Design a protein around this ligand. Sequence first.
Ligand SMILES: Cc1cc2nc3c(=O)[nH]c(=O)nc-3n(C[C@H](O)[C@H](O)[C@H](O)COP(=O)(O)O)c2cc1C
Ligand code: SF4
Ligand code: SF4
Ligand code: SF4
Ligand code: FES
Ligand code: FES
Ligand SMILES: [K+]
Lengths: 213, 263, 43, 429
Amino acid sequence: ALFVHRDTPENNPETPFDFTPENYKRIEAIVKNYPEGHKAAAVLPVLDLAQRQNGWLPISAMNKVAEILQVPPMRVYEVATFYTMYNRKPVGKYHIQVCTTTPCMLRNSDSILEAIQKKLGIKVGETTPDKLFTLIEVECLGACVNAPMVQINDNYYEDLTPKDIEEIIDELKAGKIPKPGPRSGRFSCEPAGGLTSLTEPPKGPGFGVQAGL
Amino acid sequence: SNLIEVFVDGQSVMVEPGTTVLQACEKVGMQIPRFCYHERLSVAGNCRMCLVEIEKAPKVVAACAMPVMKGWNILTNSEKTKKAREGVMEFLLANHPLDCPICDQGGECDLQDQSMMFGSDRSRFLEGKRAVEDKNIGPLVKTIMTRCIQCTRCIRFASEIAGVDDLGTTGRGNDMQVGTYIEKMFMSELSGNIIDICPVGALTSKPYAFTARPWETRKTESIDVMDAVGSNIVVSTRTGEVMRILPRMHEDINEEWISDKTR
Amino acid sequence: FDNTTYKNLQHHDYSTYTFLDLNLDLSKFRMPQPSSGRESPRH
Amino acid sequence: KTSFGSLKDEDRIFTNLYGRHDWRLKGAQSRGDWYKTKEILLKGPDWILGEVKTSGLRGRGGAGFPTGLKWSFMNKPSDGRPKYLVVNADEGEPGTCKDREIIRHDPHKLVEGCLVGGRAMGARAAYIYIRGEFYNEASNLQVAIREAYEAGLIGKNACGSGYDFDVFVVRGAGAYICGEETALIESIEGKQGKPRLKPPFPADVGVFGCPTTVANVETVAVSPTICRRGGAWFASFGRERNSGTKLFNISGHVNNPCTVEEEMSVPLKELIEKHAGGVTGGWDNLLAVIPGGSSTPLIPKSVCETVLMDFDALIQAQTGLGTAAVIVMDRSTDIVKAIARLIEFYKHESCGQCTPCREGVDWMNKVMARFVRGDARPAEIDSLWEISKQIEGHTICALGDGAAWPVQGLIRHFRPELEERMQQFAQQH
Ligand SMILES: Cc1cc2nc3c(=O)[nH]c(=O)nc-3n(C[C@H](O)[C@H](O)[C@H](O)COP(=O)(O)O)c2cc1C
Ligand code: SF4
Ligand code: SF4
Ligand code: SF4
Ligand code: FES
Ligand code: FES
Ligand SMILES: [K+]
């Protein structure tokens, strides 16, 4: 990945981009979350909204965000290139993001990564020729107790095995969307083979309240 | 009345509140090493070359940014201070390119000189070095950005002195790069001043390139006549030829800047 | 009292604009923002 | 007390930790949330801060600073600027996933904590900075916030106490460094997530240049229960200056990796076998444990035998509690490769602002890569140790320290493994 921009036919300042009228209503609500006189605070959410509409960020999208919020364009380029979730070149319909940090590495995240590469016929960092999937590695995704796991767009898929990740790809490739969450049988982060705590009904309002309150 | 008392190596100094540790040391004639700090720019505190030990404090403090407290004893020459300087210098030079013979900064380089005075004399870096691509920002300033030490002086000057928010940092970590991101020219009437404030040969005068070394130039202190401001200048000559024009500090006229026509 | 099923199933149906739709939905409740006194730091 | 770690369900705070009950307002109220919130707000900030102080609560974000004293920096007359509470939900420390469960399964505890904690500080609003990957978790929090607004619990006249309070949710864009308190604030302001030097401290000049307190999600979420049940109840768990209950994440080489709430100062071995189902291959197969997320030095099996999980105990073991995220490594682990991957993580996350971490961490990463293959000399181990000491304590923020400590832990307890690899490589070349 490069952190300088070179204009091309597919990505230059005249590349067409504008927010849809509905997304301008969403931008107005975003900007109102911050004190008057501090509109630059909306750069990150608005820049991310431009990506949620367009899928990625052409330089023309960065210029529009700067124009709307009246910030210098360079200050938007700085944000776009600093945060890893901004796609500065096109990505596939399904951005597969495999966590390969140590807690996930210990629970065999390499097998998940090899399973995906074998199925899609692409290497890490590539897009499939059909442009349906892009594959990359990422750092801890905050689901370590559910390792190994991947994120596809907004959804987590956890407690994976090579068989499980192939089924998810087959479902996305078939037009369906699979359910997020663990695939090992458990629901979330509880220990497998039965709960070890929180097995009794929770207490009700006012339980254990100190006197004098 | 309003002054507070601090000590620099046990020597009492009276300073106004808000004075930084670096400024208190200046009052006793001790210049703390620096790279990112410039008295005419906003405080950055990112190079860490100014780290200094405060007596009875386990953690060294950035002298450029830290305001001094009453009764502090700043130890500008203690072993802790010296080891911090060597470590920071070691990190600055780890990826710096072996460019001194071909680099125009050589001979008047703050990285060379503070390495000699405050750094170690050898390397224990056994890896390959980083290398970054150059940026075209106009006909006046040549960029060799592998030499950049990411001090952000040019960014702060462009934004604050020149009022041009065109320079910034892109990327993260060891890949962080100073530039414009897009292909752009930094053509402001005060643009040439980033050559002076860049501590290294990352930003250099294109017209001047390769023509002289600092130690051989004769300095004539003179005045600029390109406008009616009367900016104070130094005319650098060698063997009877004018080699370049530099600013000369004058607080009441041009501070330490000149315009590009003057330069 | 059931403790055997998962009660956090709503997010299975969340969409691309779900978070920002809720933020827009919440604008009607926010107290008026404070003002630094100018339009921006460059004014 | 001498033994700790048999916490009863009635003493647990996050009673929907596993999402087996309705996470929404109706379920949250049935479980005690939002109960008598008006009375707490009418008691005043000094009473609320007093409760937080006597509970001995400490920061659950990884640094463990006394919460009651920290929150008291905001108890001062207004100078005209608004005051803000920023709740840290960035959750980036590898091994740590506790704050994720609170946000999606007990969101109303976090919202109520924002109001109670905000009241004590005198804040007008709370900004909840959640990492951008947690999209579904953020939407759950927004749904809960909308429920609280419509019931009058927050907003104008919050809970009928006459206190106006807003709760905003701001999402990140993918940066572990944005969990650092000043980097988080800069990120909220629309800049790169680069930390600030201190002073000024956030309680004086913070988000938008205004008085601000940054608090971890878990620190905030427990504050309403400490007020209802009292600081003395909380302080009856764990050792002195190590009070309360704590969320633990047990990942790595354990039979049943899980998140669980347990009492502070529980033995590490007791935690791993009572809740996680023991070490994969049994306790004798244990090699090393990272007790508090990737930034805390590892400890070997010998130390793991009797170490307690609290700030003081783990410090004496030459590590730290951190986020209380326990990563377990068994005897089949390539320990050098495991730590090298963490150094690679810190290489990818360093903001690049300041010299020792921008250059030093990348340098340490290169050395560790050669150490994994054994392509080095034993003299380079002391060099690497010295390099890590030049980063620690010389950077703007603690990410530099968090990169040096894992390296120091490996050299401290696994030097012969490093030297053995070097011998093999030399023998084969
Ligand atoms: C690199 C880095 C990442 C951090 N990430 C988090 C985080 O994700 N969540 C958190 O609560 N604190 C994090 N911290 C610690 C915060 O800076 C801060 O100490 C904490 O949020 C204060 O809240 P507390 O007192 O409730 O713990 C991080 C610190 C560093 C240096
Ligand atoms: S900037 Fe200084 S140290 Fe670097 S190559 Fe040029 S003269 Fe040498
Ligand atoms: S180009 Fe020069 S002035 Fe600008 S950040 Fe790099 S070293 Fe500093
Ligand atoms: S220590 Fe690293 S992450 Fe922290 S400010 Fe310095 S460069 Fe940025
Ligand atoms: S290490 Fe993969 S989710 Fe944390
Ligand atoms: S001169 Fe102080 S950190 Fe750079
Ligand atoms: K220069």
